[PDB]
Design a protein around this ligand. Structure first.
Ligand SMILES: O=C(O)c1c(-c2ccccc2)nn(-c2ccccc2)c1C(=O)O
Ligand SMILES: [Zn+2]
Ligand SMILES: [Zn+2]
Length: 266
Protein backbone atom coordinates (compact mmCIF):
# COMPACT_ATOMS: atom_id res chain seq x y z
CA UNK A 1 0.00 0.00 0.00
CA UNK A 2 1.30 3.23 -1.42
CA UNK A 3 1.01 6.80 -0.07
CA UNK A 4 0.48 9.96 -2.16
CA UNK A 5 3.83 11.35 -3.43
CA UNK A 6 5.73 14.00 -1.43
CA UNK A 7 5.76 17.55 -2.78
CA UNK A 8 8.69 18.15 -5.21
CA UNK A 9 10.49 21.52 -5.21
CA UNK A 10 11.45 22.79 -8.67
CA UNK A 11 15.29 22.50 -8.98
CA UNK A 12 17.47 24.45 -11.45
CA UNK A 13 21.08 24.28 -12.76
CA UNK A 14 23.66 25.58 -10.29
CA UNK A 15 24.60 28.54 -12.59
CA UNK A 16 21.02 29.92 -12.16
CA UNK A 17 21.78 30.22 -8.39
CA UNK A 18 25.41 31.38 -8.62
CA UNK A 19 25.98 34.88 -7.20
CA UNK A 20 27.97 37.39 -9.29
CA UNK A 21 29.10 40.98 -8.58
CA UNK A 22 27.39 43.87 -10.35
CA UNK A 23 28.07 43.96 -14.11
CA UNK A 24 27.70 47.36 -15.82
CA UNK A 25 25.53 47.43 -19.02
CA UNK A 26 25.40 51.20 -19.57
CA UNK A 27 25.89 54.39 -17.55
CA UNK A 28 22.95 53.85 -15.12
CA UNK A 29 22.06 50.14 -15.76
CA UNK A 30 23.63 47.08 -14.09
CA UNK A 31 23.07 43.32 -14.01
CA UNK A 32 22.87 42.35 -10.28
CA UNK A 33 21.36 38.81 -10.34
CA UNK A 34 23.06 35.48 -10.79
CA UNK A 35 25.30 34.02 -13.69
CA UNK A 36 22.16 32.69 -15.43
CA UNK A 37 19.16 34.79 -14.32
CA UNK A 38 18.78 38.49 -15.14
CA UNK A 39 17.94 41.09 -12.50
CA UNK A 40 18.49 44.69 -13.73
CA UNK A 41 19.24 47.62 -11.44
CA UNK A 42 18.66 51.12 -12.92
CA UNK A 43 20.20 53.82 -10.69
CA UNK A 44 19.05 57.46 -10.97
CA UNK A 45 19.52 60.75 -9.04
CA UNK A 46 15.91 60.27 -7.87
CA UNK A 47 15.95 56.61 -6.74
CA UNK A 48 16.45 53.11 -8.20
CA UNK A 49 14.34 50.66 -10.27
CA UNK A 50 14.62 46.85 -10.29
CA UNK A 51 13.58 44.80 -13.40
CA UNK A 52 13.02 41.21 -12.22
CA UNK A 53 14.52 39.48 -9.14
CA UNK A 54 15.09 35.91 -10.35
CA UNK A 55 14.45 32.92 -8.09
CA UNK A 56 12.67 33.10 -4.37
CA UNK A 57 16.06 32.47 -2.67
CA UNK A 58 17.78 35.46 -4.39
CA UNK A 59 16.39 38.36 -2.20
CA UNK A 60 19.41 38.81 0.19
CA UNK A 61 21.95 38.63 -2.68
CA UNK A 62 20.03 41.33 -4.61
CA UNK A 63 20.07 43.55 -1.50
CA UNK A 64 23.85 42.98 -1.04
CA UNK A 65 24.49 43.95 -4.68
CA UNK A 66 22.27 47.08 -4.28
CA UNK A 67 24.29 48.09 -1.17
CA UNK A 68 27.55 47.55 -3.13
CA UNK A 69 26.16 50.01 -5.75
CA UNK A 70 25.18 52.58 -3.03
CA UNK A 71 21.43 51.82 -3.21
CA UNK A 72 19.85 51.46 0.28
CA UNK A 73 16.46 49.68 0.93
CA UNK A 74 14.74 53.11 1.17
CA UNK A 75 16.29 54.06 -2.25
CA UNK A 76 14.54 51.28 -4.19
CA UNK A 77 11.30 52.90 -5.53
CA UNK A 78 9.95 50.50 -8.18
CA UNK A 79 9.95 46.83 -9.27
CA UNK A 80 8.88 45.94 -12.87
CA UNK A 81 8.51 42.39 -14.29
CA UNK A 82 9.05 40.57 -17.59
CA UNK A 83 6.59 37.89 -16.49
CA UNK A 84 5.34 36.56 -13.13
CA UNK A 85 6.90 33.08 -13.14
CA UNK A 86 8.81 31.79 -10.06
CA UNK A 87 12.17 32.06 -11.81
CA UNK A 88 11.82 35.86 -12.45
CA UNK A 89 9.29 37.16 -9.87
CA UNK A 90 10.33 34.71 -7.09
CA UNK A 91 11.59 37.19 -4.45
CA UNK A 92 9.16 40.15 -5.11
CA UNK A 93 7.04 39.67 -1.92
CA UNK A 94 10.20 39.50 0.24
CA UNK A 95 11.80 42.57 -1.48
CA UNK A 96 8.55 44.56 -0.90
CA UNK A 97 8.70 43.70 2.87
CA UNK A 98 12.44 44.64 3.13
CA UNK A 99 12.50 47.90 1.03
CA UNK A 100 10.51 50.94 -0.08
CA UNK A 101 9.67 49.33 -3.46
CA UNK A 102 6.27 49.37 -5.07
CA UNK A 103 5.30 47.04 -7.93
CA UNK A 104 3.95 48.18 -11.33
CA UNK A 105 2.46 45.57 -13.64
CA UNK A 106 -0.23 44.92 -16.28
CA UNK A 107 -3.55 43.28 -15.12
CA UNK A 108 -2.57 39.79 -16.32
CA UNK A 109 0.85 39.86 -14.50
CA UNK A 110 -0.82 41.33 -11.35
CA UNK A 111 -3.40 38.55 -11.18
CA UNK A 112 -0.78 35.79 -11.60
CA UNK A 113 1.62 37.49 -9.07
CA UNK A 114 -1.27 37.75 -6.51
CA UNK A 115 -1.78 33.95 -6.83
CA UNK A 116 1.97 33.31 -6.41
CA UNK A 117 2.07 31.62 -9.83
CA UNK A 118 -0.51 28.94 -8.85
CA UNK A 119 -3.14 27.75 -11.36
CA UNK A 120 -0.73 28.49 -14.20
CA UNK A 121 -2.29 27.92 -17.68
CA UNK A 122 0.44 25.37 -18.48
CA UNK A 123 2.34 24.39 -15.28
CA UNK A 124 -0.80 24.10 -13.09
CA UNK A 125 0.40 24.25 -9.19
CA UNK A 126 3.85 22.98 -10.17
CA UNK A 127 5.82 26.24 -9.87
CA UNK A 128 4.38 28.24 -6.96
CA UNK A 129 6.21 31.13 -5.14
CA UNK A 130 5.13 33.63 -2.39
CA UNK A 131 2.19 35.80 -3.61
CA UNK A 132 2.64 39.79 -3.90
CA UNK A 133 0.30 42.64 -4.71
CA UNK A 134 0.80 45.18 -7.53
CA UNK A 135 0.55 48.85 -6.46
CA UNK A 136 -0.02 50.30 -9.96
CA UNK A 137 -1.73 48.78 -13.02
CA UNK A 138 -0.21 49.67 -16.46
CA UNK A 139 -1.68 49.61 -19.98
CA UNK A 140 0.12 48.78 -23.24
CA UNK A 141 2.46 51.62 -24.30
CA UNK A 142 2.16 53.34 -20.93
CA UNK A 143 5.28 55.14 -19.66
CA UNK A 144 6.77 55.24 -16.15
CA UNK A 145 9.51 57.80 -15.44
CA UNK A 146 12.09 57.59 -12.59
CA UNK A 147 14.97 60.15 -12.33
CA UNK A 148 14.39 60.97 -15.98
CA UNK A 149 14.81 57.41 -17.17
CA UNK A 150 11.59 56.67 -19.13
CA UNK A 151 10.38 53.05 -19.11
CA UNK A 152 7.88 52.05 -21.81
CA UNK A 153 5.72 48.89 -21.56
CA UNK A 154 5.26 46.80 -24.77
CA UNK A 155 2.77 43.93 -24.25
CA UNK A 156 4.09 40.65 -25.86
CA UNK A 157 1.54 38.01 -24.75
CA UNK A 158 2.26 34.28 -25.21
CA UNK A 159 4.81 32.89 -22.77
CA UNK A 160 2.35 34.26 -20.25
CA UNK A 161 -0.77 36.33 -20.92
CA UNK A 162 0.95 39.27 -19.14
CA UNK A 163 4.41 38.99 -20.79
CA UNK A 164 5.95 42.50 -21.29
CA UNK A 165 9.08 43.98 -22.99
CA UNK A 166 10.40 47.09 -21.14
CA UNK A 167 12.34 49.72 -23.12
CA UNK A 168 14.44 52.70 -21.95
CA UNK A 169 17.24 54.99 -23.12
CA UNK A 170 20.51 55.15 -21.14
CA UNK A 171 23.99 56.49 -22.25
CA UNK A 172 27.49 55.13 -22.92
CA UNK A 173 30.33 57.52 -23.95
CA UNK A 174 28.06 60.53 -24.16
CA UNK A 175 25.90 58.62 -26.72
CA UNK A 176 22.36 57.21 -26.30
CA UNK A 177 21.90 53.44 -25.83
CA UNK A 178 18.34 52.21 -26.49
CA UNK A 179 18.04 49.17 -24.19
CA UNK A 180 15.33 46.51 -24.80
CA UNK A 181 14.55 44.07 -21.99
CA UNK A 182 12.39 41.66 -24.06
CA UNK A 183 10.43 38.89 -22.32
CA UNK A 184 10.80 35.13 -23.04
CA UNK A 185 9.36 33.76 -26.34
CA UNK A 186 9.66 30.05 -25.22
CA UNK A 187 6.76 27.66 -24.84
CA UNK A 188 8.33 25.03 -22.48
CA UNK A 189 6.11 21.92 -22.62
CA UNK A 190 3.05 23.96 -23.73
CA UNK A 191 0.09 22.59 -25.63
CA UNK A 192 -0.09 25.24 -28.41
CA UNK A 193 -3.03 24.21 -30.66
CA UNK A 194 -6.71 23.95 -29.47
CA UNK A 195 -5.76 24.88 -25.85
CA UNK A 196 -9.05 25.51 -23.97
CA UNK A 197 -7.31 27.70 -21.33
CA UNK A 198 -5.62 29.83 -24.07
CA UNK A 199 -7.71 29.63 -27.33
CA UNK A 200 -5.73 32.38 -29.23
CA UNK A 201 -2.28 31.31 -28.02
CA UNK A 202 -0.81 30.95 -31.56
CA UNK A 203 -2.01 34.38 -32.88
CA UNK A 204 -0.68 36.03 -29.68
CA UNK A 205 2.80 34.52 -30.17
CA UNK A 206 2.74 35.60 -33.89
CA UNK A 207 1.90 39.21 -32.93
CA UNK A 208 4.56 39.05 -30.19
CA UNK A 209 7.32 38.00 -32.67
CA UNK A 210 6.42 41.15 -34.69
CA UNK A 211 6.40 43.41 -31.60
CA UNK A 212 9.83 42.16 -30.53
CA UNK A 213 11.36 42.54 -34.06
CA UNK A 214 10.33 46.21 -34.11
CA UNK A 215 11.49 47.39 -30.61
CA UNK A 216 13.98 50.30 -30.27
CA UNK A 217 16.95 48.03 -29.69
CA UNK A 218 20.66 49.08 -29.61
CA UNK A 219 21.14 46.44 -26.85
CA UNK A 220 18.86 43.39 -26.24
CA UNK A 221 18.73 41.67 -22.81
CA UNK A 222 16.46 38.71 -21.84
CA UNK A 223 15.34 37.12 -18.53
CA UNK A 224 17.32 33.93 -19.37
CA UNK A 225 20.60 35.55 -20.69
CA UNK A 226 21.42 32.57 -22.93
CA UNK A 227 18.33 33.31 -25.05
CA UNK A 228 19.89 36.60 -26.29
CA UNK A 229 23.48 35.11 -26.28
CA UNK A 230 24.70 36.97 -23.20
CA UNK A 231 27.42 35.39 -21.01
CA UNK A 232 27.37 37.21 -17.69
CA UNK A 233 30.39 35.24 -16.33
CA UNK A 234 32.53 36.46 -19.33
CA UNK A 235 33.30 39.91 -17.77
CA UNK A 236 34.42 42.40 -20.41
CA UNK A 237 33.18 40.24 -23.31
CA UNK A 238 29.56 39.35 -21.40
CA UNK A 239 27.56 41.10 -24.15
CA UNK A 240 29.81 40.77 -27.18
CA UNK A 241 27.85 37.99 -28.94
CA UNK A 242 24.40 39.33 -27.98
CA UNK A 243 21.61 38.95 -30.59
CA UNK A 244 19.72 41.90 -32.11
CA UNK A 245 15.96 42.01 -31.25
CA UNK A 246 15.36 41.02 -34.95
CA UNK A 247 17.54 37.89 -34.62
CA UNK A 248 16.04 36.92 -31.21
CA UNK A 249 12.48 37.14 -32.70
CA UNK A 250 13.45 35.15 -35.82
CA UNK A 251 15.13 32.36 -33.80
CA UNK A 252 12.08 32.18 -31.44
CA UNK A 253 9.67 31.97 -34.34
CA UNK A 254 11.72 29.20 -36.04
CA UNK A 255 11.76 27.24 -32.74
CA UNK A 256 7.99 27.79 -32.32
CA UNK A 257 7.20 26.52 -35.85
CA UNK A 258 9.24 23.34 -35.13
CA UNK A 259 7.39 22.80 -31.85
CA UNK A 260 3.99 23.20 -33.64
CA UNK A 261 5.03 20.55 -36.17
CA UNK A 262 6.22 18.19 -33.40
CA UNK A 263 2.88 18.71 -31.60
CA UNK A 264 0.84 17.81 -34.70
CA UNK A 265 3.09 14.72 -35.08
CA UNK A 266 2.49 13.77 -31.39
O1 LIG B 1 10.12 30.72 -17.31
C1 LIG B 1 9.92 29.50 -17.72
O2 LIG B 1 8.82 29.13 -18.10
C2 LIG B 1 11.09 28.60 -17.75
C3 LIG B 1 11.72 27.88 -16.60
C4 LIG B 1 11.32 27.83 -15.18
C5 LIG B 1 12.24 27.26 -14.28
C6 LIG B 1 11.93 27.21 -12.92
C7 LIG B 1 10.73 27.74 -12.47
C8 LIG B 1 9.82 28.31 -13.36
C9 LIG B 1 10.12 28.36 -14.72
N1 LIG B 1 12.81 27.26 -17.07
N2 LIG B 1 12.89 27.52 -18.44
C10 LIG B 1 13.96 27.09 -19.10
C11 LIG B 1 14.85 28.08 -19.59
C12 LIG B 1 16.03 27.84 -20.27
C13 LIG B 1 16.41 26.51 -20.43
C14 LIG B 1 15.60 25.47 -19.93
C15 LIG B 1 14.39 25.75 -19.27
C16 LIG B 1 11.96 28.35 -18.92
C17 LIG B 1 11.71 28.86 -20.29
O3 LIG B 1 11.11 29.95 -20.49
O4 LIG B 1 12.06 28.11 -21.23
ZN1 LIG C 1 8.43 31.72 -17.67
ZN1 LIG D 1 11.94 31.70 -17.07
Amino acid sequence: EVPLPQLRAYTVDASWLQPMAPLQIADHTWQIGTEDLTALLVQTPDGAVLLDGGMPQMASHLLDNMKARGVTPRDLRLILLSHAHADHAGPVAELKRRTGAKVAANAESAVLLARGGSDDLHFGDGITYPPANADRIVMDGEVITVGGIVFTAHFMAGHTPGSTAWTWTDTRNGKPVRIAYADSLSAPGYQLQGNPRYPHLIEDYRRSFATVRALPCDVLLTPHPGASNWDYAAGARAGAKALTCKAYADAAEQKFDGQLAKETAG
